[PDB]
Amino acid sequence: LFIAQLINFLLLIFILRALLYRPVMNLLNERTRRIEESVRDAEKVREQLANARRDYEAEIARARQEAAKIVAQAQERAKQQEAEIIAQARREAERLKEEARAQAEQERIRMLSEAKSQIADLVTLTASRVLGAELQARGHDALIAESLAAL
Amino acid sequence: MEGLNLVATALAVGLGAIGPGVGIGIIVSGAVQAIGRNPEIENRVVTYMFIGIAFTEALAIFGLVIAFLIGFG
């Protein structure tokens, strides 16, 4: 009687461990993995929310600090260049103003060269002045006769 | 042993009614379903339904009258 029940029970388990072992293990493994992804997933709703504050703090700090520094560094580079280039061209304008000083020298040259220009009317046109004053009284009758002979 | 006549009559009517009952049920179910699919052929449907019902009732009537013949002389 007892041997009848014992032999049947062990052999039944031996074929249950051959067929109804892998799927029954796999179902509990799949649920445990889902809870492994889901208990973790629930810690995450709050874990990502905690990470959201970390992400917000990191992003704001990284951006605003760098934005303030880079823009001001760009501003300082530009502001310095704004005054410098403005003053740099002013000396070039003063260099153009030095050309007026050169133009003054050219004007100075013009008046200095006018020491013969207006004098020419006094000198080259004082030849006929002497024709009327010095030449007029001077007796050049002999010269006139010589010119007539040359004719 | 003299009650065998009553048992015979009862068996006759009951077993001659069970078959035609199912037959009539199936006939009416099929006719009603076919009319539901198409109501315009209902005249011919009803005609053949009564034809089959008449055959089944003829079998049942044969059973009933032979039960009467058994019940009486």
């Binding site: 009687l1 009848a4 029940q5 049947n8 074929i15 509990l28 649920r31 445990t32 809870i35 629930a42 | -």
Partner: protein, 266 residues
């Protein structure tokens, strides 16, 4: 494989009898079904507190499988009605687990082989063995101290009546005077069908109790007879069928209870 089914060692006959009243030396006599019922209650409470004393997230081991079964029960009962999916859950869950473990108890050796008593011996050229039992003396019967709790018409009747009372009370919890409207309302033919409805409602617990008791007792008897016919290597598929149908009927009882509750409230 096909030559090791010797019949030389086995029971002498097949014993069939309702649970035998125990000795009950002190007052308030008990049966062999009552003691196994109490021990299975103890086992159920022990497993419940084992899953309870360590309650935490990501369950593993016993608690993981327990929560699997419990949430599967929630999913199954939710598909019927979610209105009372939790209010009536403890009763059906407890009855389910206890019936499960009671049907599991019938496979345990010693059930029917242990007698509380309040080869050569086998007949040759016969299909069944004829080895006299240990308790064969004193003209006794070798009363099975270990028995299936649901193989007795006292527990099955008890859970049936308590389930019926629970269902009727929870229907009466919020239905107003709508019961009499469902029973012989005197509205054409609606009065007639309510009578059969009332009788069916009355006989539902009796049907459940008789069904469960018959299932379990028949399983026990058929296993005993299969053991008597051929001792070894024969009754393996039938033992597998029994271990299947025990759990199956265990879940069926709770499912039917919930379904009757829903059909009474709606």
């Amino acid at each position: 494989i096909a030559s090791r089914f010797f019949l030389y060692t086995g029971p002498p006959h097949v014993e069939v009898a309702a649970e035998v009243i125990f000795d009950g030396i002190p007052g308030f006599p008990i049966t062999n079904s009552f003691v196994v019922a109490i021990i299975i209650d103890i086992f159920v409470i022990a497993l419940a507190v084992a899953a309870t004393r360590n309650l935490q997230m990501v369950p593993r081991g016993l608690q993981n499988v327990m929560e699997f079964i419990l949430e599967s029960l929630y999913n199954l009962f939710r598909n019927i009605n979610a209105k009372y999916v939790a209010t009536a859950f403890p009763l059906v869950a407890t009855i389910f687990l206890f019936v499960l473990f009671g049907n599991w108890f019938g496979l345990l050796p010693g059930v029917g082989s242990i007698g509380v008593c309040h080869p050569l011996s086998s007949v040759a050229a016969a299909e069944g063995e004829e080895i006299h039992d240990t308790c064969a003396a004193q003209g006794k019967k070798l009363v099975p101290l270990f028995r299936a709790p649901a193989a007795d018409l006292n527990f099955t009747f008890a859970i049936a009546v308590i389930s019926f009372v629970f269902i009727e009370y929870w229907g009466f919890r919020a239905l107003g005077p709508g019961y009499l409207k469902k029973f012989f309302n005197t509205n054409g033919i609606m009065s007639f069908v309510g009578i059969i409805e009332f009788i069916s409602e009355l006989v539902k617990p009796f049907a459940l109790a008789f069904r469960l008791f018959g299932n379990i007792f028949a399983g026990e008897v058929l296993l005993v007879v299969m053991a008597f016919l051929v001792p070894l290597l024969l009754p393996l598929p039938f033992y597998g069928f029994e271990v299947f149908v025990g759990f199956i009927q265990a879940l069926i009882f709770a499912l039917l209870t919930y379904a009757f509750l829903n059909i009474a409230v709606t």
